[PDB]
Amino acid sequence: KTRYYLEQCIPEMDDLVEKGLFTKNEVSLIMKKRTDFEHRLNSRGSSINDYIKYINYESNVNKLRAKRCKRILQVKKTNSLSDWSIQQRIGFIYQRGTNKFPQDLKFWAMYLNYMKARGNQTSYKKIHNIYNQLLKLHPTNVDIWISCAKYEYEVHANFKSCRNIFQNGLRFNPDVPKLWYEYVKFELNFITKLINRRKVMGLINGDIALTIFDVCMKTLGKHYINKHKGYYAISDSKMNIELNKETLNYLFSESLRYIKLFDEFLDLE
Amino acid sequence: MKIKTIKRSADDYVPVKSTQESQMPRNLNPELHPFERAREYTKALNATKLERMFAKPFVGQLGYGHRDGVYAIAKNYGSLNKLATGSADGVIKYWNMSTREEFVSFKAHYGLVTGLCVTQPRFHKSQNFMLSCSDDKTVKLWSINVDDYSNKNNEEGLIRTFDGESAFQGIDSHRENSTFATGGAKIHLWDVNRLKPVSDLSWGADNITSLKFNQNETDILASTGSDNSIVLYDLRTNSPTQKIVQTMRTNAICWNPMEAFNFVTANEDHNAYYYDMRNLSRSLNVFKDHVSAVMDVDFSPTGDEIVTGSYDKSIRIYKTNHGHSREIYHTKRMQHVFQVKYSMDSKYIISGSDDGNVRLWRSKAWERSNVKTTREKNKLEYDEKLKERFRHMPEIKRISRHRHVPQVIKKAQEIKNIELSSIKRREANERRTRKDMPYISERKKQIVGTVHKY
Amino acid sequence: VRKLKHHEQKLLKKVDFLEDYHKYNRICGDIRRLANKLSLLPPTDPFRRKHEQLLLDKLYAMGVLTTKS
Amino acid sequence: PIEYLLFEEPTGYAVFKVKLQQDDIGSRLKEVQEQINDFGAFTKLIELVSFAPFKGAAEALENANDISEGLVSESLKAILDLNLPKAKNITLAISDKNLGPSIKEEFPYVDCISNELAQDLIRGVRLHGEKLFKGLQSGDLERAQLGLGHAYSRAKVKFSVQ
Amino acid sequence: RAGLKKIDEQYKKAVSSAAATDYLLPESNGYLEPENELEKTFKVQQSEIKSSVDVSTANKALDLSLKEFGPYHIKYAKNGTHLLITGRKGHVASMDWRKGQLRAELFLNETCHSATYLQNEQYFAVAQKKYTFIYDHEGTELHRLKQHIEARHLDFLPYHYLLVTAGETGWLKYHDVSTGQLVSELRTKAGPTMAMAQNPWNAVMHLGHSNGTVSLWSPSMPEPLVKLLSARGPVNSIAIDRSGYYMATTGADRSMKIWDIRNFKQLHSVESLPTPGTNVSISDTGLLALSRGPHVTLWKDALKLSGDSKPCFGSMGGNPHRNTPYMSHLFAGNKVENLGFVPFEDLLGVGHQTGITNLIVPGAGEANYDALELNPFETKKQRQEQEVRTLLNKLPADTITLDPNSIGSVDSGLRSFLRKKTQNVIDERKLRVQKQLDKEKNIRKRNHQDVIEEALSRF
Amino acid sequence: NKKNLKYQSSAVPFPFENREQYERSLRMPIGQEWTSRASHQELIKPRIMTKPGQVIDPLKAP
RNA sequence: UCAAAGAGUGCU
């Protein structure tokens, strides 16, 4: 269905010629590169780099159209299909590459970053959708889940949703101390802003993390026991003592980071 | 001086990759593509032949069938793979047609099974229910275990029996509510949670042979009488509404699922009549390609197509706006068709005959049930419209219209045509002299009278 | 051409256009026609009987007929 | 009426979405059956949406025992809830009828399917194996099966290095 | 009215879609316009143009000199990939000019007047004297046609898979390659066929004869659809533009005529020619090529109704209305046997006794080729489906019509003797009763539409 | 030049209500060799459709 | 090697 994709490019090509931004020969050259890429994308041996090589191409075309808009038309935005045609295409390139190659966490990353950058053009709901699928394909990668929890606590400052992410993550991957480490950091990120807000409130007029800390050891200890043990329980008593020791030493060292984490927080007791 | 010459970039036309698809240049200038009309005709004429060699309607039969002739078929309007079938032996069967086996087999009545309908009784997922009526003067509600869902894990067998003073000859269920109607010596409205008939409907003393509830305006009911009459009822008033007395008896009815006010009737004059509820003085359409009495008729859930079963050992399936059958299904082993019904996905036809076999037929003989590629669907989609464009071409008509019809039906038709010509010459001869003849519309000859004039 | 698929075979047939003994087949047939024409001529006129005998002798001189026939 | 499919692997749990529902009328005809064998046709039926690898060897055996007894593990309860919509009732295909009641208890909003139509899809998911994962890291199933085999087998016997 | 409007709107959407594809077309044709008005397109020499074009284009331009069996008639495959040249004394070689690989060579020492590919490069026919010979891809002869005798002209219809031959016998042989059977034999009754041509638009053959009348011929039809004489002298060659609208001819009396096939009207007549044209060719772009003795002169924008578009040799005081030759080229000490445009290529072929050479001409070839019809880049595997799918879509000979659009319109013992008497007396009774009906039918029309005699009218 | 009876429609095909309507469609080509890929999907598209394996539940109250 | 013809594999 190579022609189907090329045909959707015809209306904007006509708009470019109609507005005078690009001449017919110049517009013809653009289509030639688009046609060559589309065959590369739809063929066998297509790799994620082909999406990346294409995705950069219309990005450059987008810049030139913007410059020629000011250079010829002397208009910031000409009300026609050309303005949003490329950006709609860019998202339309990304979703195929992500669907074709859900493995490449790198390609997911540009897709979110490209889209977060154009916040006005792309609603936050769609960014939530992409994270939903991205989280949904890779539940075991902590780096993803703190990423979506992050986007909603700075751009949106929704602690309820951000709580639900770190909340839901510890269920899927309770073994990773890092996600425990960040959730406690988020929990004390939250309390200080309220207390600082309370201090500001007075001027113009916590234990919850410890429970997360307490429950952190119980899960991590259990998981550290499951490993270094394999399928089967360890018959020898001395090893069973030893396996306790590594869990202990593991469960001391994790606690020692949390002692360091509190130090940065001056307001809290 | 200024010169440019046509220049090919070898990389563009021949990809550097062995795996990359070669660029597929197209130019839509009509001069590049001569003989526009001839090529489409040849593709049309080629498509029509291919349709014939691929016309493969029979798929299989349901298990081992019934012991005595099959005389009642009911589809589960909520599940695809499920039928309720009955035979005059007194046995009723509930089928898993996807596996072409029986869920369960039950000896319901001492006498003949004269009606069968599947319901969802609302007693005041894992089990399905069906209602059977017979000439032994009882109606029995049954329960069958089904394997649609595994959310549980029994009580399979008779649940309730309704005794009647007279024999029952038809049964159907109201779609929304548990109430069901039985057609005996009197048309009776029944409730599941009441053993006696809740309401007595009857225009007069004449019996009722068949009945069918509405699907869209479900409060309306139609029934057929042995006095060559069709009776309409409405439950919101709990009274009959209309009758028209017909020349011949009507054996079965089906109401159009897409038009609430439209219905078709299977008639005894080798015809099936399409009716409009509000003005029944005439018919909407007439279907006249059978040579024996039409026993059953069913509307497709698409609402655009109708299938008729007749006593002449054939199943004809007609377009709603066209008065002649587009297809015939027949077999040596099929003895008499009494029930024709549609798979409610509209892709298959379930038929029952007195040989005891319940058969699956394809609505589209040439179509195939596999999932097709995006390319594949386009070409099949191409042939249909191209055939649609060139339907009346002389060669395409000959190949498309040609069917292998059994010797007995063709002989009946050619005899049938002779009398009609023999009749037609006769009034034409009379028309030369007798002054006052009203031309009788073909849509109005078969009505005898209507009680309520309009 | 490439081997046509099953449906292609049904749609189109006999499209495969565009030691040899054709010369000898022509001789064998050409003799057969000559013998037939001689038979058509009546049984009594002397001309063919000289001729058919000449054909028997002419063929025998070669070895195509191992014996008189 | 099938929308979601639960498949279960040695490397992990895999949930599928059913884009197209195969003709349930004509399930036994050859042409639809050949589609199950054919990868191109089957990819049009379903597409992978979840894969949650097990953390390691120990957790796999614990699930291998739970699934054998038709029980829902914590890892299993994780992947379903993240995926199945709360919703009338979402329909899920599972190879085991015994596992059905367990899923229903945990999630009242899901109705389980184990009919031959579900079995047909489960067979084809299994037929293509890692091909349907579109390259998602599933290890190697044939090796992983053999390890869980000694692990699942030996557990019931209570063999020991003693 | 609304239904008619919706049908028109659907058509207007189709042309709009066709306009959309016009942007998709990859490249454009060539041009050749001077910087300075003094510079003339006819003044420019080919030696200057060959320098201008690319080295690859220089390699594409192919010139081979060989005298062994001269002269050589050149024919270009419809796709333009494979070249067939047939020597007058009898050497024919099948080869692809781009590849540089000779495909098959025949050294037969019999006078061959013309040759051509039939359906693909693989199968081609060479016209030997007094018979027609078909030669396989390998070069082996697959068959000899006894029905086709002593013909100089070989035509083939890609869509109808039919070969046409013309001879002094006057008999037109119509042979279908797929069925391997001769469709029909017809005698023109116009005498020997000096000129032969095909019109792609309607696939209607064009022939020239001594009277000069041109008779249009169809396989289905017994007698000529139209007969028109452009020139007093015999027409030595007939050319038909790619669109099929325009038709150009060369009479033996030096007089040129440009015609239009649809309206059957004569566009332009030229008698100022020094000598009768050996050959005529029309480009896919519409440019006409005329070869006269050793001079070949080309006119741009010739196929137009306007008088200023009329071709004119040189110019009369640089008059704008006068249309100068787009290019004028002369081969000294040489003669042009035939002219052939290189399909899908910006070149013109010219055949001689010295050899075969290609002349590069900006704008001569089509700018963009539709690959579904023909691809120069078709691999071997695609081509074998191309013939298969084209076989599946073979056009029957009967479908040939003057206008393609018109098609599809809407317009015992005693018992047997005693039996014979009964079927008779039945038959007369039928024949009498219709008279009574006919007579009664006459009465209704009549009804619908001396004093003494009036006194006596009653009696 | 008499026109051949073989290639003549016996009657105006449905759904067209007049003779002149039928020639207009014959002028308009359906083939992809003369129509764009997108324009084919609209001309080619059949009136009636369906999805395999699903209930075509009859019309609800409008 | 090209050159023409088969029969399987991978994959859209």
Curated annotation (Swiss-Prot), chain B:
InterPro entries, per the entry: G-protein_beta_WD-40_rep (IPR020472), Sof1 (IPR007287), WD40/YVTN_repeat-like_dom_sf (IPR015943), WD40_repeat_dom_sf (IPR036322), WD40_rpt (IPR001680), WD_repeat_DCAF13/WDSOF1 (IPR051733)
Biological processes per GO annotation: maturation of SSU-rRNA; maturation of SSU-rRNA from tricistronic rRNA transcript (SSU-rRNA, 5.8S rRNA, LSU-rRNA)
An example molecular function term from Gene Ontology annotations: mRNA binding
WD repeats: 65-105, 113-152, 163-200, 203-243, 245-285, 289-328, 332-371
GO CC, one annotated term: nucleoplasm
Similarity section: Belongs to the WD repeat DCAF13/WDSOF1 family.
UniProt protein name: Protein SOF1
Top-level taxonomy: Eukaryota, Fungi, Dikarya, Ascomycota, Saccharomycotina
Curated annotation (Swiss-Prot), chain C:
Domain of life according to the entry: Eukaryota
Subcellular location(s) per record: Nucleus, Nucleolus
GO aspect biological process, one term: ribosomal small subunit biogenesis
GO terms of molecular function: RNA folding chaperone; rRNA binding; snoRNA binding
Principal subcellular localization: nucleus
Cellular component terms (Gene Ontology): 90S preribosome; Mpp10 complex; nucleolus; nucleoplasm; small-subunit processome
Keywords: Nucleus, Ribonucleoprotein, Ribosome biogenesis, RNA-binding, rRNA processing, rRNA-binding
Subunit structure, as described in the record: Component of a heterotrimeric complex containing IMP3, IMP4 and MPP10. Interacts with MPP10. Component of the ribosomal small subunit (SSU) processome composed of at least 40 protein subunits and snoRNA U3.
Family: Belongs to the universal ribosomal protein uS4 family.
Function: Required for the early cleavages at sites A0, A1 and A2 during 18S ribosomal pre-RNA processing.
Protein name: U3 small nucleolar ribonucleoprotein protein IMP3
Organism annotation: Saccharomyces cerevisiae (strain ATCC 204508 / S288c)
Gene from which this protein is expressed: IMP3
Swiss-Prot record, chain E:
Keywords: Nucleus, Repeat, Ribonucleoprotein, Ribosome biogenesis, rRNA processing, WD repeat
Alphabetized InterPro entries for the sequence: BING4_C_dom, WD40/YVTN_repeat-like_dom_sf, WD40_repeat_CS, WD40_repeat_dom_sf, WD40_rpt, WDR46/Utp7
Entries under SMART domains matching the protein: BING4CT, WD40
Transmembrane segments: none
Residue stretches of each WD repeat: 66-107, 188-227, 230-269, 272-309
Pfam families: BING4CT (PF08149), WD40 (PF00400)
One GO cellular component term noted in the UniProt record for this chain: nucleolus
Top-level taxon of origin: Eukaryota
Gene3D superfamilies cross-referenced by the UniProt entry: YVTN repeat-like/Quinoprotein amine dehydrogenase (2.130.10.10)
Compartment(s) where it occurs, according to its Swiss-Prot or TrEMBL record: Nucleus, Nucleolus
Any one GO biological process: endonucleolytic cleavage to generate mature 5'-end of SSU-rRNA from (SSU-rRNA, 5.8S rRNA, LSU-rRNA)
Function: Involved in nucleolar processing of pre-18S ribosomal RNA.
Subunit structure and binding partners: Interacts with snoRNA U3. Interacts with MPP10. Component of the ribosomal small subunit (SSU) processome composed of at least 40 protein subunits and snoRNA U3.
Something else known: Present with 5800 molecules/cell in log phase SD medium.
Name of the protein this chain belongs to: U3 small nucleolar RNA-associated protein 7
Species annotation: Saccharomyces cerevisiae (strain ATCC 204508 / S288c)
Upper taxonomic lineage: Eukaryota, Fungi, Dikarya, Ascomycota, Saccharomycotina
Gene: UTP7
UniProtKB/Swiss-Prot annotation, chain F:
Localization per Swiss-Prot or TrEMBL: Nucleus, Nucleolus
Role of this protein: Involved in nucleolar processing of pre-18S ribosomal RNA.
Assembly description: Interacts with snoRNA U3. Interacts with MPP10. Component of the ribosomal small subunit (SSU) processome composed of at least 40 protein subunits and snoRNA U3.
Further remarks about this protein from its record: Present with 1470 molecules/cell in log phase SD medium.
Family: Belongs to the UTP14 family.
Protein name: U3 small nucleolar RNA-associated protein 14
Natural source organism: Saccharomyces cerevisiae (strain ATCC 204508 / S288c)
Gene it is expressed from: UTP14
Residue numbers of the full-length protein present here: 836 to 897 of 899
